[PDB]
RNA sequence: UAGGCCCAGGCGACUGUUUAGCAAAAACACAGGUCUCUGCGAAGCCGUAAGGCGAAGUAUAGGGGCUGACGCCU
RNA sequence: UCUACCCAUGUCCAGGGUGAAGUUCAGGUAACACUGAAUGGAGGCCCGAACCCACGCACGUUGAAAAGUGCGGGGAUGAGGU
């Protein structure tokens, strides 16, 4: 049975990657959210 | 020979006599081609103190002239007959004047005790293999009844309410549970209203053949294709062709329930 | 008088909805209205026919309905709609459609402005006096009890087993039971219907009530 | 014109076809021609709107002429041809002045004909006139609304209109639909009724056809677990003479 | 490695679709029939609005209901 | 990135059957529609592999596997699978 994770690079840049998530407001905040914690590895 | 009866046969009786009080008119359904041997002494004597007709289902498939002479037998035996074709109303009109005069009695005393007149209830009752559920079909044009063209349909009792006149209670047919004349089982057996997977056909195609032979001659020289009327079976069995030997039984008594023949009766 | 019969006949000058009725005590009125229905016992309604079935109406209905008091639901200005075949039943079959609650209430059509049929009012009033108070024998209030329970088995089982009368207006019926806790809404108007049509009880409310086994 | 088939199986009983018998090509113009691809029923939102839509056989925008305009220049009929887009066919022009077009076809034009549009053309199947200069009587079609536009009203297949009068700065004309309204007499419009006059006794016969024709299938709304709706207010309501109470 | 066959009754016209992981059916859809609204910035819908679908289509064409092949009764 | 529906572009389906329209000769005729003969290759047509499903039985149920295996079964040029 085909489980729910197929993996594929370019989709994984298109929806999680750095400018997708700078194009728009909610992704900043979340950029900046990671940075406030301190996390070594943001958007994607 | 012939000893069908189940369970639900067994359990229609009581049901009956536990319903029995709220029945103000009773039908009786009997075969139009044996009139007298479809009648059933087991339900009849359950059935006493309340007014009934007698019905006879399937009349054109019967003779009109046996017919109309038995109906003059009941009339002027003291009950109340009446002559039906269920598949196309042909005499459905004139039962509910029937059944009006009939209660009038008990209509105008509940009238004068000072209460509205109500709804007819009706219990139709009659062995298996009759109209007790076309005819009630027709009544309602409403085609609520599940019917079938072999014994054994129906297996619980119904209300059915046609309208604000009528309450009709429908009921599985019903046998006695020992036969006593063989004659009478070969007829019912003949006509239906038995599996016909518990009798012997062999017999049944016998009977059919000398019955013939006896009353209509003529009917049996033309037949199918075939003119002869020797001894035996055998002879026309082997009309239209290893052969059935005598599988054939089942075609003898295959056309004639469909009226292959002209209408016929058995009496 | 009328037909050697005295009379008495009270307005109410209308009813308008609770909730903008925030008058300077002019509503003030309404509440002489609603007296005159406790000292009354037989309830006109007036509809308009020009008008569709307003909302107001049937609650106006319900004041009337839940006071056990005989009500004749009645249509006024006729002349304004048209008066044609099929027009009587596009609003005598509307009103059952809305007003389901009272369906023994007549249904008279009359126009005061042309004064059609206006002498018709009456004969439904007299006849609605009557139902209103009324009694039926004890004997034969029972023997049709257990007539509607026998076709209809599905009352454990709740129990009946006594039926009688107690009022005159309107006709209480008292039911002694195993446990009324047993008793269904859905069944008590089943009761309802099978005396409304045992008998006449036209254009007047009826109500039921249940006492335990006692 | 109906052809029958024959029932070779079950899901040919019954069904009929068109017989193309008014065709005289195969292959469309290029010039023509422009892209045209599928919607859902979606919008520029992409949420669903309109149900029941969506899937079918692809097609290519066939540009029609439904403002004509071409006064003078007599043009001669060079083809008819069936397009998907439309209930009705087209017939393309080969203008003397040497621009080609497409235009809707009426019924009885044949090939080689010679067509022309203008205030000075004569009353016959295929011209377009003004409605003040053709008089009472006549069906026509591609009927205009307000002037430089092109063709808003009957121009499906096998509708018509009439005239009936003239009444200063209008014309009263009554629509496929028993409307009886005026227009303003500057519109243009059509003479002829459109051909392709038997499309609506073709029967489908099949689940698939309807399918390929671009269509959804339809859940009752039972199993889903007379009120004029035009307003009350609306212009050109002093412009219609006789309702469509039919 | 390769079709078991023959009779009699219901139900649904047929090919297809459904409760991933208990119910594949008589349930859903379907071709046909019928009712109702709509004269074009159409009627209906999505959006607070701008902006769109319907459609670059026009009553033999589009929305919304009810039934459900085709032969003999309504 | 699983599943529902839609949009734009690609791609897959071993073999074997039945024989519609149309066309030609032609009893028939004055010629038909209807005979037959030849040609023709339509179908949400038939049997059946790859592929896709999931109707029956058995096993497994601290399993090889948090929905499988074995033997039978349905569709298989289309309202198809990917
Ligand atoms: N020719 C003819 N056939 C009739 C007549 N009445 C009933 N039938 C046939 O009888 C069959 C249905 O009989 P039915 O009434 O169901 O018999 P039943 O007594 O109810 N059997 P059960 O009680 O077990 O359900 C059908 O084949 C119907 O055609 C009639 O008057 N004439």
């Known amino acids: ?44 | ?267 | ?214 | 014109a109906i052809k029958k088939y024959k029932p070779t199986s079950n899901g040919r009983r019954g069904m009929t076809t068109s017989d193309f018998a008014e065709i005289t090509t195969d292959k469309p113009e290029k010039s023509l021609l422009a892209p045209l691809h599928k919607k859902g029923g979606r919008n520029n939102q992409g949420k669903l709107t309109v149900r029941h839509q969506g899937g079918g056989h692809k097609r290519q925008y066939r540009v029609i002429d439904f403002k004509r305009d071409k006064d003078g220049i007599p043009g001669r009929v060079a083809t008819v041809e069936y397009d998907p887009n439309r209930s009705a066919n087209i017939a393309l022009i080969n203008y003397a002045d040497g621009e080609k077009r497409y235009i809707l076809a009426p019924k009885g034009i044949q090939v080689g004909t010679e067509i022309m549009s203008g205030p000075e053309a004569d009353i016959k199947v295929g011209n377009a006139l003004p409605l003040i200069n053709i008089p009472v009587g006549t069906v026509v079609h591609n009927i205009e609304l307000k002037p430089g536009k092109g063709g808003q009203l009957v121009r499906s297949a096998g509708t018509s209109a009439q005239v009936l009068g003239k009444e200063g700065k209008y014309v009263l004309v009554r629509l496929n639909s028993g409307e009886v309204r005026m227009i303003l007499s500057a519109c243009r419009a059509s003479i002829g009724q459109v051909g392709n006059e038997q499309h609506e006794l073709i029967n489908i016969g099949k689940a698939g056809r309807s399918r390929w024709k671009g269509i959804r299938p339809t859940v009752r709304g039972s199993v889903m677990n007379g009120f004029k709706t035009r307003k009350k207010k609306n212009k050109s309501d002093k412009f219609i003479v006789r309702r469509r109470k039919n």
């Open chain 3, 1 to 214: 008088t009328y037909n050697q019969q005295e009379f008495v006949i009270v307005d109410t000058a209308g009813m308008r909805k609770k909730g903008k009725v925030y008058e300077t005590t002019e509503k003030y009125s309404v509440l002489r209205a609603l007296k005159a229905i406790d000292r009354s016992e037989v309830v006109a309604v007036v509809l308009d026919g020009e008008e569709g079935i307003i909302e107001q109406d049937k609650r106006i209905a319900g004041y009337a309905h839940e006071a056990g008091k005989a009500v004749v639901i009645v249509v006024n200005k006729w002349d304004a709609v048209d008066k044609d075949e099929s027009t009587m039943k596009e609003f005598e079959e509307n009103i059952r459609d809305h007003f389901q609650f009272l369906d023994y209430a007549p249904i008279l059509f009359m126009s005061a402005l042309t004064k059609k049929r206006i002498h018709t009012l009456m004969p439904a009033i007299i006849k609605a006096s009557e139902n209103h108070s009324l009694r039926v024998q004890t004997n034969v209030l029972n023997d049709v009890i257990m007539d509607a329970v026998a076709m209809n088995p599905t009352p454990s089982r709740l129990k009946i087993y006594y039926a009688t009368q107690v009022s005159v207006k309107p006709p209480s019926f008292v039911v002694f039971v195993n446990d009324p806790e047993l008793m269904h809404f859905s069944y008590e108007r089943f009761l309802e219907n099978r005396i409304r049509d045992a008998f006449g009880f036209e254009g007047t409310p009826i109500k039921i009530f249940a006492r335990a086994r006692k």
């Open chain 2, 1 to 267: 020979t012939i000893q069908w009866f189940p369970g639900h046969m067994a359990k229609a009786r009581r049901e009956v006599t536990e319903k029995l009080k709220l029945i103000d008119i009773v039908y009786e359904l009997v075969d139009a081609r044996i009139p007298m041997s479809s009648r059933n002494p087991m339900i009849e004597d359950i059935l006493k103190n309340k007014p009934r007709i007698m019905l006879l289902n399937k009349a054109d498939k019967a003779d009109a002239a046996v017919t109309q002479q038995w109906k003059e037998h009941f009339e002027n035996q003291g009950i109340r007959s009446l002559s039906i074709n269920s598949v196309n109303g042909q005499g459905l009109n004139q039962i509910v004047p029937a059944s009006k005069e009939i209660l009038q009695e008990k209509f105008d005393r509940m009238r004068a005790k000072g209460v509205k007149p109500r709804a007819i209830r009706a219990l139709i009752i009659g062995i298996p293999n009759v109209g007790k559920s076309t005819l009630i079909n027709r009544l309602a044009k409403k085609n609520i009844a599940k019917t079938g063209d072999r014994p054994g349909i129906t297996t619980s009792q119904q209300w059915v309410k046609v309208g604000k006149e009528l309450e009709l209670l429908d009921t599985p047919g019903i046998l006695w549970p020992k036969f006593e004349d063989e004659l009478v089982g070969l007829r019912l057996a003949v006509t239906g209203a038995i599996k016909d997977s518990i009798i012997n056909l062999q017999d049944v195609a016998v009977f059919g053949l000398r019955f013939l032979e006896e009353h209509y001659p003529e009917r049996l020289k033309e037949r199918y294709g075939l003119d002869e009327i020797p001894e035996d079976i055998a002879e026309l069995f082997d009309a239209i062709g290893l052969i059935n030997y005598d599988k054939t039984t089942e075609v003898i008594i295959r056309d004639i329930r469909t009226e292959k023949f002209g209408r016929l009766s058995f009496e």
């Open chain 1, 1 to 44: 049975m085909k489980r729910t994770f197929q993996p594929n690079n370019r989709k994984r840049s298109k929806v999680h990657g750095f400018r997708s998530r700078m194009s728009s407001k909610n992704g900043r905040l979340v950029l900046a959210r990671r940075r406030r914690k301190g996390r070594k590895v943001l958007s994607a």
